[PDB]
């Protein structure tokens, strides 16, 4: 995350972190239930073996609420392709259930129609992760969150060198130096409504981070709600 602020105690309980064999995060995820994690399909190409850590805000200290989970099933969307980054979505089923507590809780899955009319029309969304804090720098050791404006679909399509499909949406700033970045991929994009947060996107990609005239591209979760429902049974 470029810009934004730290997630304070209990503020981003649905954040999950995909860790590799060397025990370091390479992608994010969102807790959907005690057994399921929502992430980007392109992240499954970032490590031969990985686990999921939850309840962590500082990778340098043992805050006591951390819990690592082994993955039992990886459900990648069969239509995903790195050529277009279309259908950048996957669901992970954990071997053991996540026990909810301070800093460990699920984000709400909304209904498509309501989400697209009410949530995605809000001024902003919230993205978070342990990814880079600058395009040319290192991944953060602290969980960050950033309020990102929903961007006009036309505007964003004009701003992109790559095709923004119907499964993607833009969020972020034209010039302001705040954006998600490498490492936040797969992480949560939620929208707050009456103090309840609903998953609205998955950090997917972007041409750099916080670059002038470029936006963060996210997987449009409302287009995969039926797919997610079904995956959460496999």
């Amino acid at each position: 995350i470029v810009g934004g602020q730290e997630c304070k105690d209990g503020e981003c309980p649905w954040q999950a972190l995909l860790i590799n064999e060397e025990n370091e995060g390479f992608c994010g995820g969102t807790i959907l239930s005690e057994f399921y994690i929502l992430t980007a399909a392109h992240c499954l190409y970032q490590a031969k073996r990985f686990k999921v850590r939850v309840g962590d805000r500082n990778t340098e200290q043992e805050e006591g609420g951390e819990a690592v989970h082994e993955v039992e099933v990886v459900i990648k969307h069969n239509r995903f392709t790195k050529e277009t980054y279309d259908f950048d979505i996957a669901v992970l089923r954990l071997k053991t259930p996540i026990t909810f507590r301070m800093n460990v809780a699920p984000a709400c899955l909304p209904e498509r129609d309501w989400a697209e009319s009410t949530l995605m029309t809000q001024k902003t969304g919230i993205v978070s992760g342990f990814g880079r804090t600058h395009e040319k720098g290192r991944q953060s050791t602290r969980l960050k969150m950033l309020e990102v404006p929903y961007v006009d679909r036309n505007s964003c399509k004009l701003s992109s060198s790559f095709i923004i499909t119907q499964n993607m949406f833009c969020a972020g700033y034209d010039t302001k130096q705040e954006d998600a970045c490498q490492g936040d991929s797969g992480g949560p994009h939620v929208t707050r409504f009456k103090d309840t947060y609903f998953v609205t996107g998955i950090v997917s990609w972007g041409e750099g981070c916080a670059r002038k005239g470029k936006y963060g591209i996210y997987t449009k979760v409302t287009a995969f709600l039926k797919w997610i429902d079904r995956s959460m049974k496999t």
Partner: protein, 52 residues
Amino acid sequence: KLCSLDNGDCDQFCHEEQNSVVCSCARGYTLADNGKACIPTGPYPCGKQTLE
């Protein structure tokens, strides 16, 4: 304007059926008696920042 008018007064999901507003909630919530508010059934309901 039903659901367009302040989310039909629903805490969460809003549906327009027969020019009437119908509220509903996310999994883990129970629609309150007023048919508008959503009540968490158990501890750590979805979408809520943790306090304890």
